[PDB]
Every structure is written in structure tokens, then in C-alpha cells.
Amino acid sequence: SGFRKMAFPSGKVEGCMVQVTCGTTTLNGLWLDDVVYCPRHVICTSEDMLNPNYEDLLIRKSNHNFLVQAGNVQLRVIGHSMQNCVLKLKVDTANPKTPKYKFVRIQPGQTFSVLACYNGSPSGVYQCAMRPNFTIKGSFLNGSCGSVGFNIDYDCVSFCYMHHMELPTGVHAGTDLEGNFYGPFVDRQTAQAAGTDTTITVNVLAWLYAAVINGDRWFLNRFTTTLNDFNLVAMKYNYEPLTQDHVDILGPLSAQTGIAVLDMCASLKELLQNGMNGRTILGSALLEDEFTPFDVVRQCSGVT
Amino acid sequence: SGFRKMAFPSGKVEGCMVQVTCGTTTLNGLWLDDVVYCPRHVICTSEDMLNPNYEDLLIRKSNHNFLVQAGNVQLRVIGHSMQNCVLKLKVDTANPKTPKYKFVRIQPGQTFSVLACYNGSPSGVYQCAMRPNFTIKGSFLNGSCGSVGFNIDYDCVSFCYMHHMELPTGVHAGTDLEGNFYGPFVDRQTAQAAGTDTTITVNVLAWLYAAVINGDRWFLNRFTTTLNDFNLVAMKYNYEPLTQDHVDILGPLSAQTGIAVLDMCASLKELLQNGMNGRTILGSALLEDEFTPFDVVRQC
Ligand SMILES: NC(=S)c1ccc2c(c1)OCO2
Ligand SMILES: [Cl-]
Ligand code: NA
């Protein structure tokens, strides 16, 4: 037993990380088959970053403008193109450590593992949720751009995130591996802020189930409720609307614990009014919203 | 910026995990060079749980009684010895993915990454601290025994923990890779219980230093404290005593932020008295004690 925030094992991704340099800028790249993926902002000087014309700045560059290093070994760049906000560097060598992989775009509320990297060197791994406001609450310093987020399904890595920038509030923004931003953000030095965030309701409920399953039961009660009554409380507390699809995805946990969702909503309802004033559920004084139902079942069943 | 419970990248350890079977019991082993390390209790049957005589159980085993599997490949065992509570299976192949590694015993307060594994297959990775009562608060199900705890400093893997059991309170007990238990625990199913746990004060202070580095100042105060008055107060909340060692260790974070260690102690004394009054620190509503002074500097 026990319940921890757990990343996927990062080894299939560690084998793909490289250093990419263009002028004075070094950041990370993702080496899959014979292509290196990195943020297009690698091409920009500080002056360019204010109002970049990526079309123009890139035709001006050539293959030899890009240094790619896999450990101590230089990769030869034999071509370059841009897809949305991602740069694709064609290299002369297929990565012999390329895993079974897909590029996937994740939905807000879904979780993934971040492999934080510096100078092409894996530094740490942690779990994030894609927030409703399309930011992530990561831990990133200068040099971390090009660090990726992923899930693992059996032996298949699903790459879903590439790190691009920090916003003024200290939260993080990036693209999918096709270079489409999550959220209404641009890759330039201009005024940009995160939207007011909201709490991921179905994940909070998942985590209350995780708590019950681990012998934390104090918050529970005899009552129940309606989607309609709860949602009016949720909107008041800046929680996402709970939908029939959400209630359905929590099915296994309602079953395993004997506590129905609108049962737990009643518990959750009661918790929103009052505050848990330093009091604790699974070692937290906050209502945790970065575990998905799948995260709770996966962890409380030992999937490998 | 940002601050997260961050595990070491697990790849170097992933390439070392195998499946050991003895009798009807399967658990994880660690394959370094020509040796597979696993908990000795893999040789116990139903009766051998309360009072196993491991010397007598092991002498009755031949190499062929141990089924070791690395992915699809069966590894052939050619030798066995016991060291303390760890079984060492000599095999006919050296692991070609063996990283640069060492075995280190940690002290209470130290942090490490756990690679949770089932049937020799890694499941996930997370950060733990060795608690002051010599337990860890992990996430471990049946089949997780032989999962390991590690640090990776400058390309060398330091193994510090191998998982043996869950105690009745739902906390976890294990050994170093020399097979010595952390704390008073034994590899018997006789009733055992952890000491009252306490908070790792030096780590809470390191985390308040992280908060200040990341631009939080709301919890600071105009007061200071003597070390002794700090300990007389902190022990009333089941905090570990802070030693001069701890004060020395926080010197670098003190210098970077310009807040003296005993001034930060006065903020912690106030937070214990007041709580957070609806505020958070680095996204927590609790005082966090599983980041070391070293983890704070690594991450900031
Ligand atoms: N003979 C012991 S102490 C033992 C045997 C098997 C075990 C275990 C402990 O924890 C889960 O699996
Ligand atoms: Cl130590
Ligand atoms: Na209820």
C-alpha cells in the first residue's frame, strides 16, 4: 500500500535526449529515427525574440548553423524544416536507441512524466497535469527548453509535450511534438499571462478514492447529491464542471470502495465549504487534482 | 523556477532489474556484473515466515532452484551466498548495462529515488526520505520486494535501499545493499512496529530557503531565536532536534538568501504556532520535510 506521485520510468526517453546549439543558444533536442526536434526559438538572438520573423530567420540559416551532440558524438545535420513552433533537424544517423513511439496531443486534466534536461543531459523526472488553463506547474531553469513530456503504454512512448517558456507567475508553457502550443501562447518575448486556473474535479475525486483505499475515510458521509447541485457548488469554488463521462470514468473506484461519485461529491461539497484547516488526506492539507482515475487504478494495481 | 519532488532519471537502474523465483515466490532482483541481489526471504515458504533459519533454508538450495529472468532471457545461477539479509546469486553472464555504481548506507533525513518494480519490470519512479524512525513512506504492492532506492551524482549510481516489507501502519522497511536493515526491523512476520515518527527539521528549513529563492517572503518575521529555545519549541510538535551540524549544512542557502539560519528558525517556530492561514508554500499547505539542503541547491 501507500500512494505517491509517480513518474514513468524515463530510460526509453533518456536514450533520445541530445544537445542542440545555434549561435550562443544551447538547449535540448529529441532524437528519434533520423530527426532532432527542438523549439524553433533556438534560431533567435535576444533582439529577434521581441518580434521574430521565423520564416525569414530560418531561410537565412543553413545545416552547418546547427551543432547537435549525442553525448560526446557530433551528429551531422543534413536538412532543416519548421513544423509550427518546432524545428526538425534531419541528421545522417538514425538513433539506434529509438523506442516504439507516437506523437499524441493530451487533453487538459491528463497527466504525463517530464524528463527535465540541461545541455542534452537528463536531470530529473516528475509528474505534471496539463492544467485547464493549458499551463503545467513544472520545475525548469535556463537551459531546460526542449525537455519533453510523455506517457508509456506497454513498450510504446507517447510523446505529448516539449518545453518552450516560463510565464510571469512561474508556470510553464510548451507545444505538442507537432509544434502546436497548449494554450493561447506565442514563442516571442511579449506580454503573456496564464488564464485564471480551475481545479480538475474528476482528479480530486480520483484522489479521494485513493485516500479511502489507503484507509483515510474520515472525510466521508451518509449523503449523496446531483450533478446539477454539485456543479453549482463547483462553479462557485472555480472547479471544472463534472460531466456524466467523468462519473463514468470513476466507475471502478465507486465499485472498489462502495462510495458513489455523488456520495464523494457530497464529501467533496462539505470539504469546499469548510477548508480542512491544516487537517490532512493522504499527507496533504490541499485537495490534490493532478492524479487521474487511471493514475489511481494503475498505481493501486501495479501495472508495469 | 517552480519546485517539485523530482526523482533521478531511472534508465541506469531499469537496465539492472530482473525477476527472481524460488518456490511459488516471485520478486525483483538487482543485476550488477555477474551478481543478482535480492531479499533473502525469497527462500521462505508458508511456515518459514515467523522464525526462518535462513542458514538452514539456504544450505538445502541448489543453484537450479533459483529461476532468474532478464526480460525473456533465463540467466543461469552458478553460485549463491547470503550477506546479512541480502541473497547474492552468481550468474554465468555479466550485465552489459551495468552502470558505474556504488553501495552507500544513508542516514535519516537523506532522500533517494525509488524504482517500483513488479516481476522484474519497472512500474514508476518517485522520491522518498529515510524517516527518523528508519522507515520510508513509499508506494509498494505485493511483488514489489527487491525494488531499490538510489541517487545518481555525476553519472555514478549509489544504491542505498532494497525493499523487504510493509509494517502494519502502511510504511516500508528495507536494507542497504549490504543487507543490513535500516532501524530495528527483522525479515520475520513477527509483530513489529515503527517508532513514533518525527519531522525532519533541517529539511523543512531547506524547503523554506527554497520558497524564499522562488520569491515567497510572507512567512518571514522580524524575530530570531537561540538554537536551544528553537529545539524546546520544535520538539513540542514532534520535530527532530536541530544540531550545529544542521546549522552548518544550511550555511550556503543562508548566504544565497541573506537570512541567518536562526532567523529562519524563528519563522518555522511561528508557522508551527499559526499554520498557514489559507496560504501555500511552493504549492503545499503543509511544511514539507522530504527535500534536503543538497536537493534544494540541485533544483534551484
Ligand atoms: N519472511 C518474510 S519476512 C516475508 C516473506 C515474503 C514477503 C514479505 C516478507 O513481504 C512481502 O512478501
Ligand atoms: Cl546520508
Ligand atoms: Na457520501
Alpha-carbon gap, residue B142 to B70, rounded angstroms: 20
Residue A128 sits in the same domain as residue A207: no
Approach to solving: X-ray
Are A28 and A150 members of one domain?
A: no
CATH number at residue B256: 1.10.1840.10
Q: Cβ distance A9 to A288 under 8 Å?
A: no
Strand partners, B157: B101, B152
**What element of type H or E holds B266?**
helix B261-274
Q: What length is written for chain B?
A: 300
Indicate which of B125, B197, B281 best probes the interface with A, i.e. most A CBs within 10 Å of its own CB: B125
Domain boundary among B48, B70, B99: B99
Amino acid type, A269:
K
Nearest to B201 by CA among B106, B295, B265, B296: B265
B156-166/B101-103 β-pairing:
parallel
| Cell numbers that stand for A215 in this block | 484507509
Cβ proximity of B202 and B109 under 8 Å: yes
Judge whether B145 counts as a catalytic residue: yes
Statement to judge: residues B159 and B210 lie in one domain: no
Domain endpoint, select from A99, A121, A139: A99
CA distances (Å), origin B299, targets A269, B103, B190, B214? 37, 24, 41, 11
What was the resolution (in A) of this experimentally determined structure? Answer: 1.7
Contact A230, A244 (CB under 8 A): no
- Please report the residues numbered 170 through 189 in chain B whose beta carbons come closer than 8 angstroms to any beta carbon of chain A: 170-172
Pairwise CB contact (< 8 Å): B117 & A14: no
SS3 at position B205:
helix
Indicate if B296 and B202 belong to the same structural domain.
yes
Tell me whether residues B139 and A166 touch, CB distance under 8 A. no
Atom 10 (ligand 1): residue with closest C-alpha?
B165
CA pair distance B51, B47, nearest whole angstrom: 8
User: Minimal CA–CA distance to B19: which of B92, B120, B142, B115?
Assistant: B120
- Look at the block and give the residue holding cell 527539521: B201
The verdict on A133 touching B (C-beta cutoff 8 Å) is no
* B126 close to A4: Cβ distance less than 8 angstroms: yes
Q: Which three cell numbers, joined as nine digits, stand for B149?
A: 532506492
Same domain, A295 and A205: yes
Same domain flag for A229 and A141? no
Determine contact: B276 vs chain A, CB below 8 A. Answer: yes
- For residue A30 the three cell numbers come to 529529441
List all residues of chain B from 153 to 172 with a beta carbon under 8 Å from chain A. Answer: 166, 170-172
The SS3 of residue B172 is strand
Grid cell in block for residue B254? 543562508
Q: What is the 3-state secondary structure (H, E, C) of chain A?
A: CCCCCCECCCHHHHCCEEEEEECCEEEEEEEECCEEEEEHHHHCCCCHHHCCCHHHHHHHCCHHHCEEEECCEEECEEEEEEECCEEEEEECCCCCCCCCEEECCCCCCCEEEEEEEECCEEEEEEEEECCCCCCECCCCCCCCCCCEEEEEECCEEEEEEEEEEECCCCCEEEECCCCCECCCCCCCCCCCCCCCCCECHHHHHHHHHHHHHCCCCCCCCCCCCCHHHHHHHHHHCCECCCCHHHHHHCHHHHHHHCCCHHHHHHHHHHHHHHCCCCCCECCECCCCCCCCHHHHHHHCCCCC
Ligand 1 pocket by Cβ (under 6 Å): B 41, 44, 49, 52, 145, 165, 187-189
Q: Do A185 and A242 sit in the same domain of this protein?
A: no
Least Cα distance to A134 among A197, A202, A203 occurs for A197
B17-22/A148-153 β-pairing: unpaired
CB–CB of B260/B251 below 8 Å?
no
Co-location of A113 and A187 in the same domain: yes
Domain that holds residue B78: 15-99
Q: Is B172 a catalytic residue?
A: no
Q: How far apart are CA B74 and CA B282, in angstroms?
A: 47
Closest CA of chain A from B204, distance in Å: 15
Q: Mark whether B232 and B130 lie in a shared domain.
A: no
Q: Are residues B223 and B288 located together in one domain of the fold?
A: yes
Q: How many other β-carbons are positioned within 10 Å of the β-carbon of residue A205?
A: 28
Question: Is the Cβ–Cβ distance between A262 and A227 less than 8 Å?
Answer: yes
Closest CA to B8 of B176, B206, B158: B158
Between positions 108 and 127 of B, the ones with CB within 8 A of A are 115-119, 121-126
Gap between the Cα atoms of A180 and A164, Å rounded: 11
Mutate which of A4, A163, A214, A288 to disrupt the B interface (most B C-beta within 10 Å)?
Answer: A4
Do B161 and B178 contact (CB within 8 A), yes or no?
Answer: no
Query: Are residues A166 and B283, on separate chains, in Cβ contact within 8 Å?
Result: no
Residues B204 and B181 in one domain: no
How far apart CA A179 and CA A208 sit, in angstroms, is 35
- The answer on B275 and B158 residing in a single domain is no
CB under 8 Å to B198, separation ≥6 — which residues? B132, B133, B238, B239, B240
3-state class of B115 per DSSP? strand
Cα–Cα distance for residue pair A253/A205, rounded to 1 Å: 9
CATH number of residue B176's parent domain: 2.40.10.10
Strand A35-39 and strand A67-70: pairing?
unpaired
Instruction: Write out the three cell numbers for A271.
Output: 470539504
Nearest to A233 by CA among A282, A284, A223: A223
- For residue B294, give the C-alpha cell: 543538497
**Residue A71: φ, ψ to 5°:** 65, -110
* 3-state DSSP helix/strand/coil % of chain B, to nearest 5: 25, 30, 45
Element (H, E) at B152: strand B148-153
Final residue belonging to a domain, choices A197, A217, A249: A197
A 10 A CB-CB count for B270 gives 16
Record the cell numbers describing residue A188, joined without a space.
516571442
Domain count, chain B: 3
Question: For the purposes of burial, counting CB atoms within 10 Å of the CB of A155, is it exposed (0-12), middle (13-18) or buried (19 or more)?
Answer: exposed
